[PDB]
Amino acid sequence: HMSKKISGGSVVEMQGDEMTRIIWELIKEKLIFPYVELDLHSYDLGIENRDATNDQVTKDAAEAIKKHNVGVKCATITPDEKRVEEFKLKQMWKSPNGTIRNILGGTVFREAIICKNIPRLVSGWVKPIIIGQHAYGDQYRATDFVVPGPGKVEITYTPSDGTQKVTYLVHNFEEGGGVAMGMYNQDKSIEDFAHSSFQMALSKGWPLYLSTKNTILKKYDGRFKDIFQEIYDKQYKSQFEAQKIWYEHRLIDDMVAQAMKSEGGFIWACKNYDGDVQSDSVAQGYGSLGMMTSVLVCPDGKTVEAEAAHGTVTRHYRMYQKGQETSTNPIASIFAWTRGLAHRAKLDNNKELAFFANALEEVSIETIEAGFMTKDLAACIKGLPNVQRSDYLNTFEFMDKLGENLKIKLAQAK
Amino acid sequence: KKISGGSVVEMQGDEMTRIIWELIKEKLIFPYVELDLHSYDLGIENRDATNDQVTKDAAEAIKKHNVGVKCATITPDEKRVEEFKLKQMWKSPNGTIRNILGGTVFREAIICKNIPRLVSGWVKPIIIGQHAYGDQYRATDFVVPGPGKVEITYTPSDGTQKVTYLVHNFEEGGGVAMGMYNQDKSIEDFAHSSFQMALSKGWPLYLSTKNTILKKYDGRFKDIFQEIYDKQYKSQFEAQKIWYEHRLIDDMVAQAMKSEGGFIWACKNYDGDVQSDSVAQGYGSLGMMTSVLVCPDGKTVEAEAAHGTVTRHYRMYQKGQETSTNPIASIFAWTRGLAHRAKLDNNKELAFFANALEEVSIETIEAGFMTKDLAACIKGLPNVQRSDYLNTFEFMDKLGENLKIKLAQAK
Ligand SMILES: NC(=O)c1ccc[n+]([C@@H]2O[C@H](COP(=O)([O-])OP(=O)(O)OC[C@H]3O[C@@H](n4cnc5c(N)ncnc54)[C@H](OP(=O)(O)O)[C@@H]3O)[C@@H](O)[C@H]2O)c1
Ligand SMILES: NC(=O)c1ccc[n+]([C@@H]2O[C@H](COP(=O)([O-])OP(=O)(O)OC[C@H]3O[C@@H](n4cnc5c(N)ncnc54)[C@H](OP(=O)(O)O)[C@@H]3O)[C@@H](O)[C@H]2O)c1
Ligand SMILES: [Ca+2]
Ligand SMILES: [Ca+2]
């Protein structure tokens, strides 16, 4: 007898670049499509198609996520001066992640996948650390310019209702020039950031910490601390205490030290810049960047976008281009699919898709914990200089082993 | 007679660090070194009394005598302005001093062989050179109460046309906004201090910026570092088989976590403040750290104790109860300052004493004599017993004994 495939529903797919693009196709062909039939709204976010469409494909992909609520994104190249020369781009297009995050809005939650046999670089980290980055404002919408010489730099606020213009002196340059910057953030954006952070901490049963530098920026960072405390006392304190958890504000330099010596197991709300930086530090501390997942939680509580936290792994792609053997970890990209398929299952109440999404996550961890892993995870065990070829599998061997273990697990469940 | 010390500017601190500060002088320094001490009370009550005037006066004396040693002070918050009834929420005296003097704050962990590190690969130390000027620590921030236009404007001093850039058109409510700056001469000094530190240590140098987002602001740091490197330091770097490279701050924090150490990390003001606490904690203990501000003149130095004032131990001390306060950060502030003082004066005896006090401190902990916090780093706090550590006086008395023996066998 033949087995019918799972009806998956509508998912927005965004193809990427370089080695993650190769991994992306292997995941679809071997892990998803044999078992799930999807109404796939696919958008080619490769660097060449973004140039051909003048980055309009990035625009349409973001709007498609709005309409279908679920999106899975492959890692894409952010153009710099080297990529403009390499691909002969018309202009230096903006980062597709920044464009997508601008249209959707929300908080980017990043979390490392943990395997019991993969040692971390930070010894005490047992439970995962979930960092929630406020995906709006601060340095990423700032106006910076070069000060060419001596002169007065001021920042002013002119109320829209007419009068009461206020001028703040930044610096009076007296010897030479330099640089100056102005940046901002919005009350409504910080409020949505707070709600998603308190909701995430409650759904996991973990305490929440928000990091600012309000000792120095008493008004700018004070607004973040004030809004978080206001919403916590009014709408979340009793729920936190009922779950034996808590929320506390922390100075950023105190937060990174507390996290370094902690055991993990907490939600770490971060401002835009801090979330970008500390997430890569935390990801590397757990072992490998190929194990860090990411999901954008939009303020509507209904739209999400999952993707791997790492990039396109250009160094491995070059090896792949010259025919050399590679060992690229696909776990983060796999969990981008499972997190998106799980959310699609939740919205549609698709028990079959929900069971499948979790089974693929279990197969991935069970395979590594059974001793079958890529070179990056073997280096966590033995140290890179001591890794033998027999200690790991290449990019295609690991995908094959995952595909076989997934076929076995889904057959047993039936 | 005793060792001649010379002129040293001392800044007294608050609470427990102020107690240990006095203990360090009379037990470890004064019995062996005569000092021309120019004292400045940076206590929270004296700073409120003079409206923080004693802080700028202390910085000027550091400019005059070129050596400064600073105790940990209180940075007031809302609870502190109530406990002390302060006129205002005064800012950190370190930020005031760093702004007057400028330069680079070099931070490095104080390593002990028996104190376990938290990052498995950090077998070699990491030195962070934090730019001590501008950015968020000299900024102006304010609340945007509603819809309106926030603009930044540059008016040239020579009378040429001013430029106005739009920051944001607030149209859906209020929020916050801030302006911040840095100076070319200060960044050039930041570059020179970094290249010289790497050449002195024989380690590679990395600079972290976010020039993919702040193309002009952070791009100036990258461009200035690269021009000074290619024109004045590349040949010396290649002769010692070391290199300088710019790194994205995202990539660099990951590169440092999986590295083995042994490099200089030039950071902007904010990154150096945050990352140095991460690095110091990763090497074993957050308090086991040195912090020396190197001024661009090449002769002025201010060594500070970067950890807190240990308020809980101060309350225990005020109630007459025993405490176990770690004094190593305050001790190394003295030895680092005395070492630079000996270099300026060609004082071979003072230079030997400064290195001897550092070695005694490391040897004492490695021999098993240590405060309660370091014993918790080894055994774990719930497994630490009273016999596993020494109290505040006991550890300071053990250091003084071991120091006297070491200086005796030297002669
Ligand atoms: N979400 C996104 O779209 C996104 C995010 C960041 C960067 N990028 C883009 O990706 C491109 C590459 O940037 P990058 O190389 O700096 O970042 P990256 O691709 O994360 O860096 C790859 C490096 O990190 C390690 N690594 C990362 N992912 C891995 C995996 N899945 N398996 C095994 N090892 C892994 C490897 O170290 P070894 O060298 O030791 O093997 C590899 O060289 C850039 O064009 C960048 O713009 C995209
Ligand atoms: N360099 C500076 O000038 C500087 C820097 C930061 C903060 N501060 C100021 O210092 C004040 C203290 O703030 P805080 O509450 O963060 O105090 P703290 O000094 O960080 O004390 C926090 C806790 O950590 C442990 N600890 C810290 N230092 C220790 C030491 N030397 N030996 C043993 N244990 C130690 C103690 O734990 P147990 O009680 O468990 O023993 C202590 O209760 C603040 O007012 C702040 O403004 C100054
Ligand atoms: Ca990042
Ligand atoms: Ca700090």
Q: Which two tokens stand for residue B197?
A: 């530190």
Nearest Cα residue to B24 out of B7, B36, B12? B12
Cβ contact (<8 Å) for A156 and B154?
no
Task: Return the biggest CA–CA distance within chain B.
Answer: 76
Q: Are residues B172 and B189 in the same domain?
A: no
Chain A: residue nearest B377 by CA?
A: A261
Q: Any bridge partners for residue A212, and if so which?
A: A251
Q: Is residue B19 domain-resident?
A: yes
Q: At what angle do helices A272-285 and A252-261 cross, to 10 degrees?
A: 20
A279 Cα–ligand 3 center, Å:
6
* Residue B291 backbone dihedrals phi, psi, to 5 degrees: -150, 110
Q: Are residues B151 and B126 in the same domain?
A: no
Alpha helices in A28-141 (DSSP H): 47-52, 56-68, 81-87, 96-104
The last residue of one of the domains, among B219, B250, B283, is B283
For testing the chain B interface, which of A99, A110, A170, A224 should be mutated: the one with the most B CBs within 10 Å?
A170
Q: Which two tokens stand for residue A32?
A: 């998803």
Alpha helices in B179-248 (DSSP H): 184-201, 217-228, 234-239
Question: Cβ contacts (< 8 Å) between B249 and chain A: which residues?
Answer: 277
Cα torsion A398, A404, A408, A413: sign: positive
Q: At what angle do helices B348-366 and B392-410 cross, to 10 degrees?
A: 130
Do A261 and A128 form a contact (C-beta atoms < 8 A)? no
Do A43 and A57 form a contact (C-beta atoms < 8 A)? yes
The answer, yes or no, to whether any atom of ligand 2 lies below 6 A from the CB of B326, is yes
Of the partner residues A153, A223, A254, the one whose CB lies closest to the CB of residue B181:
A153
Give this entry's resolution in angstroms: 2.4
Question: Cβ contacts (< 8 Å) between A249 and chain B: which residues?
Answer: none
Alpha helices in A142-248 (DSSP H): 187-204, 220-231, 237-242
Do A124 and A173 form a contact (C-beta atoms < 8 A)? no
- Looking at the complex, report in whole angstroms how far the Cα of residue A127 sits from the nearest Cα belonging to chain B: 16
**DSSP state for residue A234 in the 8-state scheme:** I
The answer, yes or no, to whether any atom of ligand 2 lies below 6 A from the CB of B256, is no
A3 Cα–ligand 3 center, Å:
43
Q: What residue numbers bound the domain in which B165 lies?
A: 140-179
CATH label of the domain that carries residue A51: 3.40.718.10
CA separation (Å) from A164 to A40, A158, A187, B154, B319? 53, 7, 21, 21, 53
CA separation (Å) from A342 to A95, A410, B59, B173? 27, 16, 60, 35
Chain A: residue nearest B281 by CA?
A: A257
Q: Is residue A403 domain-resident?
A: yes
Q: Are residues B43 and B91 in the same domain?
A: yes
B306 Cα–ligand 2 center, Å:
10
Residue A198, C-beta contacts closer than 8 angstroms, at least 6 positions apart: A208, A231, A232, A235, A236, A240, A247
- Bin A105: left if φ > 0, else alpha if -120 < ψ < 50, else beta: left
Burial class (CB in 10 A: 0-12, 13-18, 19+), A240: middle
Q: Is residue A186 domain-resident?
A: no
- Looking at the complex, report in whole angstroms how far the Cα of residue B310 sits from the nearest Cα belonging to chain A: 14
Cα torsion B271, B273, B274, B275: sign: positive
Q: Are residues B301 and B334 in the same domain?
A: yes
Q: Are residues B107 and B150 in the same domain?
A: no
Each residue of B228-267: b (16+ CB within 10 Å) or e?
bbeeebeeebeeeebebebbbbbebbbbbbbbebebbbbb
The last residue of one of the domains, among B256, B283, B310, is B283
Task: Give the closest residue (by CA) to ligand 1 atom 25.
Answer: A289
Each residue of A311-332: b (16+ CB within 10 Å) or e?
bbbeebbebbeeeeebbbbbbb
Amino acid at A217: L
Ligand 2, closest atom to CA A254?
A: 16
Q: Which two tokens stand for residue B90?
A: 């005064």
Each residue of B334-367: b (16+ CB within 10 Å) or e?
bbbbbbbbbeeeebeebbebbebbbebbbbbbee
* Residue A82 backbone dihedrals phi, psi, to 5 degrees: -75, -40
B317 Cα–ligand 2 center, Å:
14
Do A153 and A147 form a contact (C-beta atoms < 8 A)? yes
Give the C-alpha separation, A387 to A381, whole Å: 9
Chain B: residue nearest A152 by CA?
A: B155
Distance of CA A247 to the CA centre of its chain: 23
Question: Cβ contacts (< 8 Å) between B156 and chain A: which residues?
Answer: 148-151
CA separation (Å) from B396 to A239, B95, B337, B391? 48, 30, 20, 8
How many domains does the structure of chain B reveal?
3
Element (H, E) at B113: none
B52 Cα–ligand 4 center, Å:
20
Collapse the DSSP code of A129 into the 3-class scheme (helix H, G, I; strand E, B; otherwise coil) and give the result: strand
Burial class (CB in 10 A: 0-12, 13-18, 19+), B159: exposed
Amino acid at B127: I
| Residues flanking ligand 1, CB < 6 Å | A 75-78, 97, 289-290, 307, 310-315, 328-329, 332, 376; B 251
Give the C-alpha separation, B253 to A72, whole Å: 27
B143 Cα–ligand 3 center, Å:
28
For testing the chain A interface, which of B183, B185, B188, B268 should be mutated: the one with the most A CBs within 10 Å?
B183
For residue A19, the ligand closest to its alpha carbon is: 1
Do A249 and A210 form a contact (C-beta atoms < 8 A)? yes
Q: Which two tokens stand for residue B207?
A: 């600079």
Cβ contact (<8 Å) for B277 and A254?
yes
Burial class (CB in 10 A: 0-12, 13-18, 19+), B311: middle
In which residue are the tokens 């702004």 written? B99
Question: Cβ contacts (< 8 Å) between B183 and chain A: which residues?
Answer: 173, 175-178
Collapse the DSSP code of A52 into the 3-class scheme (helix H, G, I; strand E, B; otherwise coil) and give the result: helix
Q: Any bridge partners for residue A168, and if so which?
A: A155
For residue B293, the ligand closest to its alpha carbon is: 2
Nearest Cα residue to A360 out of A45, A116, A60, A33? A33
Q: Are residues B96 and B2 in the same domain?
A: yes
Cβ contact (<8 Å) for A155 and B157?
no
Do B103 and B296 form a contact (C-beta atoms < 8 A)? yes
Q: Are residues B191 and B277 in the same domain?
A: yes
Q: Which two tokens stand for residue A214?
A: 């309000």
Do A381 and A117 form a contact (C-beta atoms < 8 A)? yes
Cα torsion B365, B366, B369, B373: sign: positive
Do B22 and B325 form a contact (C-beta atoms < 8 A)? no
Residue B152, C-beta contacts closer than 8 angstroms, at least 6 positions apart: A143, A145, A153, A154, A155, A156, A170, A180, A181, A182, B164, B165, B167, B179
* Residue A31 backbone dihedrals phi, psi, to 5 degrees: -110, -35
Q: Is residue B288 domain-resident?
A: no
Collapse the DSSP code of B304 into the 3-class scheme (helix H, G, I; strand E, B; otherwise coil) and give the result: strand
CA separation (Å) from B230 to A90, B191, B199, B217, B267? 31, 12, 14, 21, 20
Nearest Cα residue to B402 out of B26, B27, B10? B27
Query: Which of B17, B97, B310, B322 to mutate to test ligand 2, by most ligand atoms within 8 A of the CB atom?
Result: B310
B162 Cα–ligand 3 center, Å:
36
Q: Which two tokens stand for residue B227?
A: 């021009």
Q: Are residues B167 and B188 in the same domain?
A: no
Which residues precede a break in chain B, with C-to-N distance above 2.5 Å?
Answer: none
**In the sheet where A151-159 sits, what is the strand order?**
A166-173, A151-159, B148-156, B163-170
Do A76 and A45 form a contact (C-beta atoms < 8 A)? yes
**From the CB of residue B148, how many other CB atoms can be counted at a distance below 10 Å?**
23
Task: Give the closest residue (by CA) to ligand 2 atom 38.
Answer: B312
Nearest Cα residue to B178 out of A216, A177, A100? A216
The answer, yes or no, to whether any atom of ligand 2 lies below 6 A from the CB of B310, is yes
Query: Which of B70, B309, B324, B386 to mutate to test ligand 2, by most ligand atoms within 8 A of the CB atom?
Result: B309
The last residue of one of the domains, among B225, B257, B283, is B283
CATH label of the domain that carries residue B221: 3.40.50
Give the C-alpha separation, B23 to B397, whole Å: 10
Do A128 and A114 form a contact (C-beta atoms < 8 A)? yes
- Given the DSSP bridges, would you call strands A178-186 and A143-147 parallel, antiparallel or unpaired? antiparallel
Q: Any bridge partners for residue A11, and if so which?
A: A40
How many CA atoms are closer than 13 Å to the CA of B76, on its beta-carbon side? Answer: 21
Q: At what angle do helices A351-369 and A331-348 cross, to 10 degrees?
A: 160
Query: Which of A23, A133, A310, A376 to mutate to test ligand 1, by most ligand atoms within 8 A of the CB atom?
Result: A310
- Bin B51: left if φ > 0, else alpha if -120 < ψ < 50, else beta: left
Q: Is residue A401 domain-resident?
A: yes
Q: Which two tokens stand for residue B211?
A: 């020039």
Do A170 and B152 form a contact (C-beta atoms < 8 A)? yes
| Way the structure was solved | X-ray
Amino acid at A26: L
Cβ contact (<8 Å) for A160 and B148?
yes
**From the CB of residue B183, how many other CB atoms can be counted at a distance below 10 Å?**
22
Nearest Cα residue to B67 out of B288, B350, B291, B292? B292
Nearest Cα residue to B288 out of B109, B69, B73? B109
Q: Are residues B127 and B267 in the same domain?
A: yes
Give the C-alpha separation, B192 to B200, whole Å: 12
Q: Is residue A361 domain-resident?
A: yes
Do B275 and B267 form a contact (C-beta atoms < 8 A)? yes
**In the sheet where B301-304 sits, what is the strand order?**
B33-41, B3-12, B67-70, B301-304, B289-294, B104-109, B126-131, B263-267, B205-209, B244-248
Q: Are residues B219 and B278 in the same domain?
A: yes
* Residue A291 backbone dihedrals phi, psi, to 5 degrees: -110, 0
Q: Which two tokens stand for residue B53?
A: 């005037």
How many CA atoms are closer than 13 Å to the CA of A135, on its beta-carbon side? Answer: 26
Cβ contact (<8 Å) for B179 and A168?
yes
Q: Is residue B107 domain-resident?
A: yes
How many CA atoms are closer than 13 Å to the CA of A152, on its beta-carbon side? Answer: 13
Give the C-alpha separation, B54 to A99, whole Å: 50
Collapse the DSSP code of B5 into the 3-class scheme (helix H, G, I; strand E, B; otherwise coil) and give the result: strand
Give the C-alpha separation, A306 to B75, whole Å: 42
Q: Which two tokens stand for residue A29?
A: 């062909």
Dump the DSSP string for B235-282: HHHHHTT--EEEEEHHHHHHHHHTS---EEEEE-HHHHHHHHHHHHHH
Q: Are residues B274 and B404 in the same domain?
A: no
Give the C-alpha separation, B178 to B132, whole Å: 19
Q: Is residue A51 domain-resident?
A: yes
Q: Are residues B159 and B247 in the same domain?
A: no
Residue A290, C-beta contacts closer than 8 angstroms, at least 6 positions apart: A308, A310, A313, A328, A329, A330, A331, A332, A374, A376, A377
